[PDB]
Design a protein around this nucleic acid. Structure first.
Ligand SMILES: [K+]
Ligand SMILES: [K+]
Lengths: 64, 115, 64
DNA sequence: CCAGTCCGTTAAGGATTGCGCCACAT
DNA sequence: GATGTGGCGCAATCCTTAACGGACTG
């Protein structure tokens, strides 16, 4: 069966590799996406923090 | 032509191989003490090497000014722009790039640079 | 030649493959970290919003 | 001719990459 | 047991680069 073991394995090795070659590409892409996402988020947290601190100061400005 | 074909070619004692730290060292010492000229003379201090070889070795590899850094994008822009005008005037173009020898550009262009 | 050609190539090959294995290890890392903070910011955004919302109800529902 | 320069061209050999054999983790 | 991965060597090929061999200048 050795012959068979080989033939089958060589097919497996190629599939395994095409898979990994894709995974690596997909991964390199996630790095872009995330970095971009992370950027807009860090922006949103700033924004909200301003709106929040403002609204608070607003309350703290109303008389009893 | 006859004498030049023999004196500068057939002579079996003409080392035309790689340069050893020592060989490069003797040239750097000399060129540093007597200047980057008189290559025919300087060569005499190097078994097997003729002046031309020493000169080319100094200008392309040993001269301290020669930058061995990766090609920046700025340099590339200059090269491409200049080549559109001048063509394969490597020597000419070389004057536009701080520490790059005409040979460096010629190489860079003929490989890396050609898309 | 042949004998040395091979020895020399094998070095180049091991080298080239290593370099790649490392770049793919970094990218795999750069993603994790980017996924970590990204998750963190997402939470921070959730918090701030809730607060903003709550604070605003309280404000609109004030006496008059 | 001489001493310097220039430039096209190409051997030399390092960097990649597809293929298949293997060990062995899953 | 059968299948999926990570290594590795081979070879053919991609890529760069050093520097040789004409040719030109003054
Ligand atoms: K000599
Ligand atoms: K220069």
């Amino acid at each position: 069966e050795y012959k068979i073991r080989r033939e089958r394995n060589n097919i497996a090795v190629r599939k395994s590799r095409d898979k990994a070659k894709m995974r690596n590409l997909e991964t390199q892409h996630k790095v872009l996406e995330l970095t971009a996402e992370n950027e807009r988020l860090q922006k949103k947290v700033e924004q909200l923090s301003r709106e929040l601190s403002t609204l608070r100061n607003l309350f703290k400005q109303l008389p009893e | 032509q006859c004498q030049h074909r023999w004196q500068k070619v057939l002579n079996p004692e003409l080392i035309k191989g790689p340069w050893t730290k020592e060989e490069d060292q003797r040239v750097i010492k000399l060129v540093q003490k007597y200047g980057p000229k008189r290559w025919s003379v300087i060569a005499k201090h190097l078994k097997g090497r003729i002046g031309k070889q020493c000169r080319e070795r100094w200008h392309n590899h040993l001269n301290p000014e020669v930058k061995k850094t990766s090609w920046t994008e700025e340099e590339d822009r200059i090269i491409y722009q200049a080549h559109k005008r001048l063509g394969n005037r490597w020597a000419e173009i070389a004057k536009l790039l701080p520490g790059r020898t005409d040979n460096a550009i010629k190489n860079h262009w003929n490989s890396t640079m050609r898309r």
